Every structure is written in structure tokens, then in C-alpha cells.
Amino acid sequence: TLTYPFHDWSQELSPRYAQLRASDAPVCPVVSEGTGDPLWLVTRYATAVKLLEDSRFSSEAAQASGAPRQEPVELRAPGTRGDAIAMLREAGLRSVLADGLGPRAVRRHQGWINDLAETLMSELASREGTFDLAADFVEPLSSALVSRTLLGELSADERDLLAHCADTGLRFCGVTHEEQVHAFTQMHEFFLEHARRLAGTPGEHLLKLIAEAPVDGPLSDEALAEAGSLLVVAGFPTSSGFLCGALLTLLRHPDAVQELHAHPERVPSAVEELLRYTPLSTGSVKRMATEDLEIDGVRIKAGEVVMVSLEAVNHDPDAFEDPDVFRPGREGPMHFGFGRGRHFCPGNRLARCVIEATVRAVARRPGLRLAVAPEEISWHEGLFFRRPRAIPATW
Ligand code: HEM
Ligand SMILES: O=C1N[C@@H](Cc2c[nH]c3ccccc23)C(=O)N2CCC[C@@H]12
Ligand SMILES: O=C1N[C@@H](Cc2c[nH]c3ccccc23)C(=O)N2CCC[C@@H]12
Ligand SMILES: [Ca+2]
Ligand code: NA
């Protein structure tokens, strides 16, 4: 009877996750609030590893039109496929995706990324009074990441349109179903008109590499538009949400920032602890059983969908000692912030790059603090990917 999700839109995780984790079942039944579909939910690290490393639990089947789902509307423009990353790997573009997202891309971009983080923070430090870290730091940094490494250079109006589409479509509630569907239509139509132009501009952004890649015909306009929409939904609200949330974590732990100021070699460990500690998605990764399967004794029938809450797994006390403590350099198992298994985040190298640049910018300037109490922060309610409306801050 427990409905999903748990409406924990701020950084305070729903107590339900710890309740289910401690129950006498390794997988617990829930019901989608948005569709009424029955779903399974996993909250334990050990069980999550077993699920996400078993390829008979399929991500593509759980994404497909008509699957039991946690979200109220399908995450695709009506009439399109909506399985972009599979379509691209299918067309044989794994080598291309690695070139635009892997370590070689990080080496191309890390210089200007760190310059931009410093320039943005330096500007804020020159101001008298308070400022807004979301509007004045995260938005320009995440927008530059999307323009320069993924899509090609966007105007402010185009960036605002894509941001609004992502915020409207990637929601559990707070907008009508038809508004949500039309957000995906608008984004698809944007790239039908503009993807070729964006791919043709100078630079090495991923969309250009995709459009220029030989495919055993070259990618059609619809396929390139689905690639554009993928890069927005997977890269934009995730990066902006996480950087906002990571800044809040740092601002609430001045002792840890002071340690990083004195010992910059410890920043990479802080990046990894932020990926474990800072909650991002309010939903779960999910997979469909492609046949009758068993998870730690519980029978999962073919066609049923099993969810894993990455936040729940990242706060599992059997995996991490004192899991609700922000402890850079804790020496436990690998976090689940980027997932697990074959679908591990391919953006993880660029994400780590921008997170590291942000942590270093903060650590160089101790004294940065929230200008309001954490409880006074206002949160966007119903987003898949948590984000505060503003982060008032000052030195
Ligand atoms: C440029 C930035 C990013 C890009 C281009 C990107 C891209 C992608 C793509 C294309 C996928 C789909 C993989 C698949 O289904 O096989 C994915 C998955 C994922 N991403 Fe990223 N991502 C970015 C940033 C982030 C950030 C900041 C996080 C922070 C937690 C994140 C967490 C994840 C997770 C957990 C998954 C796994 C989903 C699953 O297992 O079903 N991503 N990413
Ligand atoms: O490439 C995908 N992977 C999975 C997980 C996911 C990864 N990033 C996401 C962002 C929003 C929703 C889901 C995801 C998915 O549900 N997908 C629909 C939109 C993108 C597609
Ligand atoms: O909230 C969601 N999370 C992703 C998985 C994910 C979990 N954590 C993530 C972090 C970044 C990207 C994707 C994820 C997913 O598959 N969804 C389908 C409907 C809602 C949406
Ligand atoms: Ca169905
Ligand atoms: Na798999």
C-alpha cells in the first residue's frame, strides 16, 4: 500500500528508506503514485549490487513504452523511440561516446572549466553583500558544461528553453500530464530545427562528434534530435542539481572545507564522499525482469520492475560506518552516486571534473557561508533531481 515516491524534495531523506532497509525483506512492494503500477523497491547495498550486475534485469525494457513505471508520463516525445543511448551504441558509436565523454575529453576541457569556476567565484568575492550560488555560480558553470562539451554554444534564451523543458518534463508532480508530455515535444522539436546547426559549429562537443560519425547511412535528423534531448535530460538537471546540493553540503561542513584548504591533495576524496553523501534523485534506477528471476529469495515474475534507490544504498549502515556523516576519506566500498554495472554513468568523468573544480574553488576561499539557515532554503518540489530555488551566500 506504500505509494512511491516519498516526497522528500529537500536534502532530508525520507525516513521510509531506512524503514524498508531494516525490514525483514530484501525487496519491498510499493505502488507508483503517478500510474498505480506495482513496483519492487531495493534499499540495501548488498542486494542492489546483485540486481544491477545481473543483465537479465533490463534497463531498456524498463524504459520502453508501456512498462510499469514510477513516473506519471513517458519520458519521450510522442511518436519517437526515446532510447537514445541504446540507439547510439547500436549504431556502433561506443568509440565516439568514449571520445567525447572519456578521459581525453576531460583533458580537453578541464582547463577552461577550472578557469571558469575561479572567475565566477572571484566575481562573487568582489561583491559587497550577499549573492545566490545557484543563479550566480551553478547556472553559468553547468550551462557552459552543456554548451561546450555536449551540445554546442547555446544562447541564453535557448538555454532557458531547454532548462524549462527539463524542469517541466522530469517531474513526479506539480504540472499537468499534458504539460509534461509537451515539454518533451518542445525539446524534440527544438533539436529537429537546431541540432544540425549546433553540430556544425566549431569545437569538439559530443553532439558534433555524433553527427559527424560514419554509420553503416548517416544519422537522420530525428536520431540526432533524440541524441540532443538525451544530452539535456541526462546532463543538465543532474549536473545543476548535484552542484547545488554539493555546495550546500560544503557550506554546512566548514571544518571539512578548512581541511581541504590546508590539504588540497584531499579534494578528490571529498568529491567521492560528496557523490555518496549528497542526495540527487528523488526516484530510483529501475530494471525489468526479462524472465522469472529471484533476488535474495524473493521471486520476481517476468515483466515486473525492480527499483534501487541510490540515496538509500549510499546511506546503508551495513555498507558505510555512520552513513549520515559527511566524512571525506572514509574507507568503505564504492558509492552508488553514478550507479553500478553496465549502465554506470558515462558522464562520470565530466561530472567529476566539474565537481572537483567547484570543490577547489570553495576550498581556496574559506569563510564562504550560507546567508540563511539551511531550513530557510526553498526547494523545487516534485523534480526527479533535487534542486534549491536559490542558495543565498556571503563571505
Ligand atoms: C555531462 C554530464 C552527464 C552526462 C552527459 C550524463 C550522461 C548519462 C547517460 C547518457 C546515462 C544513461 C546510461 C545508460 O542508461 O546506459 C547516465 C546514467 C546515469 N547518470 Fe549520468 N550524466 C551526467 C551527469 C551525471 C551526474 C552529475 C550524476 C550524479 C549522480 C549522474 C548519475 C547517473 C546515474 C546514477 C546513472 C545511472 C542510471 C541507471 O543506472 O539507470 N550523471 N548518465
Ligand atoms: O539513457 C537513459 N537511461 C535511463 C536512466 C536515466 C539516466 N539519466 C536519466 C535522466 C532522467 C531520467 C532517466 C535517466 C532512463 O530512464 N532514460 C530516459 C531518459 C534517458 C534514459
Ligand atoms: O528519478 C529518476 N531517476 C532515474 C535513475 C537515476 C537515479 N539517480 C540518478 C541520478 C542521475 C541520473 C539518473 C538517476 C530514473 O530512471 N528515472 C525514471 C523516472 C524518474 C527518474
Ligand atoms: Ca505494460
Ligand atoms: Na546490464
Numbering used by the authors: 3 to 218, 220 to 398
From the manuscript:
Further, the in vitro assay confirmed that NasF5053 could produce NAS-C (47.4%), Asp-A (44.4%), as well as a minor product NAS-B (8.2%) (trace I). NasF5053 adopts the prism-like fold characteristic for P450s, consisting of a large domain of 10-helices (C-L) and a small domain of four α-helices (A, B, B’, and K’) and three β-sheets (strands β1-1 to 4, β2-1 to 2, and β3-1 to 2). Our systematic mutagenesis studies on the promiscuous NasF5053 and the versatile NascB identified four key resides, Q65, A86, S284, and V288, which play critical roles in controlling product regio-configurations and stereo-configurations. To obtain insights into the structural basis for regio-specificity, stereo-specificity, and chemical versatility, we further determined high-resolution crystal structures of wild-type NasF5053 in its substrate-free and substrate-bound form, and of two NasF5053 mutants (Q65I-A86G and S284A-V288A) in their substrate-bound forms.
In the substrate-bound NasF5053 structure, two cWL-PL molecules (cWL-PL-E and cWL-PL-U; E and U indicate extended and U-shaped, respectively) are present in the binding site, with full occupancy. cWL-PL-E adopts an extended conformation and forms multiple contacts with the heme group, loop β3-1-β3-2, loop αB’-αC, and loop αK-β1-4. F387 and L77 form hydrophobic interactions with the proline portion of extended cWL-PL-E. Formation of hydrogen bonds is observed between S284 and the backbone amide nitrogen of G286, with N10’ and O19’ of the substrate, respectively. The hydrophobic side of V288 also protrudes towards 7-propionate of the heme and indole ring in cWL-PL-E. On the other side, cWL-PL-U is mainly in contact with the heme, αI, αB’ and long loop αB’-αC, including a T-shaped stacking interaction network between the F388 side-chain and the indole rings of both cWL-PL-E and cWL-PL-U. The DKP ring of cWL-PL-U is further restrained by the side-chain of Q65 and extensively stabilized by secondary interactions with water, 6-propionate of the heme, N10, O19, O18, the side-chain amide of Q65 and the backbone NH of A86. Multiple hydrophobic interactions are also observed with residues lining the binding site, including V236, L233, I87, and Q65. These interactions therefore force cWL-PL-U into a U-shaped folded conformation, bringing the indole and prolyl entities into close proximity. Notably, the folded conformation of cWL-PL-U brings its C2 and N10 into close contact (3.2 Å distance), making the intramolecular cyclization between WL and PL in cWL-PL-U possible. Importantly, the indole ring of cWL-PL-U is positioned perpendicular to the heme group plane, with N1 forming a hydrogen bond with the heme-ligating water molecule, consistent with the initial step of N-deprotonation reaction by P450 compound I6. The indole rings from the two substrate molecules also form a T-shaped stacking interaction with each other.
